[PDB]
Design a protein around this ligand. Structure first.
Ligand code: 4I8
Ligand code: 4I8
Length: 110
């Protein structure tokens, strides 16, 4: 059982492990900007965007009350990238690498 005030110390190492993957985490560090990136259909396809900076802000500022909410946002981020990007694409393959790192880091914590 985690109390809300324990979540950052327990879960931040799993998020730091994702950020440490370079270049794999770079497309995930900030919200997808469809006009900037030249992908104007992004928000037509992806209904609930999520990225590392949003997860980090929520974890820093006490917006998560239970660990499932953090895990849920991490999988939202990965599933959005698998949904929007083609299986052959750089971002999709980076997503798969990050998801493998995440599974290895989150399992001992939970
Ligand atoms: C999207 O998932 C959920 O709405 C949800 C809600 C409560 C939970 N309690 C738990 O342990 O996992 C949960 C998952
Ligand atoms: C999580 O980041 C994406 O889903 C993403 C990022 C950069 C991209 N550049 C592009 O052409 O598609 C992209 C998709």
């Amino acid at each position: 059982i985690f109390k809300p005030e324990e979540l950052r110390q327990a879960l931040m190492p799993t998020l730091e492990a994702l950020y440490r993957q370079d270049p794999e985490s770079l497309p995930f560090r900030q919200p997808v900007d469809p006009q900037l990136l030249g992908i104007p259909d992004y928000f037509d396809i992806v209904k609930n965007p999520m990225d590392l900076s949003t997860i980090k802000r929520k974890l820093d500022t006490g917006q998560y009350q239970e660990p499932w909410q953090y895990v849920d946002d991490v999988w939202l981020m990965f599933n959005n990238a698998w949904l929007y990007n083609r299986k052959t694409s750089r971002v999709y393959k980076f997503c798969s690498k990050l998801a493998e790192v995440f599974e290895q880091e989150i399992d001992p914590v939970m």
